[PDB]
Amino acid sequence: EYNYDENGQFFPFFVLTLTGLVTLPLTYSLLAPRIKSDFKPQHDDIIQNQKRKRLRKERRVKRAIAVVVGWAIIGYMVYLIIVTSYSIGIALPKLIIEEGSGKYVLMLYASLLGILLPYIVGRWWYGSQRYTREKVLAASAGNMFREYEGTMIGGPIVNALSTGEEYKEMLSGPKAEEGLAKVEKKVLALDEKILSAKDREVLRKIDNPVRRKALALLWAYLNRIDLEDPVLNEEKYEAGSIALSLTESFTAIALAFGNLIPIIGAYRISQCIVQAISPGSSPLLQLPYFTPKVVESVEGADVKTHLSVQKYLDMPEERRRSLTVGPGLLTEDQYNSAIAVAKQLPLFAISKAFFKVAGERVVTPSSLVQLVIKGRIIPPRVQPPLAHAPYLPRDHPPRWHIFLADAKQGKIAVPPFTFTTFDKTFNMQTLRMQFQAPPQVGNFSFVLHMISDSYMGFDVKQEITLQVED
């Protein structure tokens, strides 16, 4: 019961107004600190280029074609405009309802609604299913879950972590067998037995190019091996960044498991991956100008205990003659910078940690009780300085994990509470966390762990006694 416009004087106005309302908006819409360091590691160009390549976003091709076609149709419609007792009509061209193009437009609409909708729906469905919560592929998490063992800490964590899925897309094609022999020989030969004992057998046993290459590259990275190939470093410093996210996923999995040793293990492997040190090696390699030689020369010839940063800095002026002697060990101009950058690391030293229920004196069973732990950041919504490790592309904001477990059974008590900010070279701080008290009556014995990633050697382990009565 409508009368279309065939002479062309009404549809141009409507289409012009609509496409203008669209294109105007589409065109108008598409028109914290860092720590001080005067040291640059080897292969600076590679790591800096990788850091710059990590982040990238254009957001211009999506709207450019839309805006240009909108302005083109606006120009065409305004050109057609400048060219030129009760009935209702429609501002639409006549050729749409003509007997010639009728079946054509009908079949076009049918094909559109039958193909484009289900195809794009299935695409979005299978595009938002493979990614998990921790930004890792579901295949990777599934493959890593089965590799979980009862009590694995240190070594086997790297083996259970080197079964990821990003390595498939990283070195796909002929990139797997390029320097496999070279990297494998270097890793298996140059490293001593105190850094790998049976991992050599676990590495030799597998028969798969992608996974073996990934594992060898991860070890070569975690040992600061400096292989001579100028093309393999650009993928090693990327395997490290992939291993970091896989470490986050493995921490999530081990936390899902109700065990204690894998938790500390995952935290230590996250501390080691974010840096360049090796799991089990002296944590003294966090300083800028330190090499295996000087750390072997400072902590003794052969020792089973590794001098942490606190006990190293707390020595009297004997390190001056014991470390930077001069014959190939170090230089005073470098040792001064090392000390000046070591005197700025965040170390959390807690002083008081007591339970307290909100609005009551004595903790009642099955009540919501919160603990206040007040320490003081002393170096050996305020943001802390970023990580100091220069051997990874991304910059990691140093976080802190606070949890507590019991000793009568090797199991965790409450889930951890991760945070990254303080309330501001030292001043008192405060940190809170709330959970549910046990249902029954009887004092318990807990120990909280101040395990923190982004650094190795900053751990506080204190025992707290809980009180409960009625």
């Binding site: 079946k103 009908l106 049918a110 609604l113 039958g114 289900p118």
Partner: protein, 32 residues
């Protein structure tokens, strides 16, 4: 008897297409 969630959607789509198919078949029969 239970049915999968995609089956009701494919049934809705097949019904929507069957309606227009019947319409166009009747139009073809009338035109000739």
């Amino acid at each position: 008897l239970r049915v999968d969630p995609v089956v009701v959607l494919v049934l809705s789509l097949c019904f929507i297409f069957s309606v227009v198919g019947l319409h166009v078949i009747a139009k073809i029969t009338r035109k000739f």
